């Protein structure tokens, strides 16, 4: 969920 996972692409 961190910004280099969910906040990046989705």
From Swiss-Prot:
Task: Enumerate the subcellular locations listed in this protein's record, separating them with semicolons.
Answer: Postsynaptic cell membrane; Cell membrane
Q: How does it assemble?
A: Pentamer of two alpha chains, and one each of the beta, delta, and gamma chains.
Job of this protein:
Upon acetylcholine binding, the AChR responds by an extensive change in conformation that affects all subunits and leads to opening of an ion-conducting channel across the plasma membrane.
Q: Family per UniProt? A: Belongs to the ligand-gated ion channel (TC 1.A.9) family. Acetylcholine receptor (TC 1.A.9.1) subfamily. Alpha-1/CHRNA1 sub-subfamily.
What this protein is called in its record is Acetylcholine receptor subunit alpha
Tell me the organism: Tetronarce californica (Pacific electric ray)
Range of the intact protein held here: 91 to 100 of 461
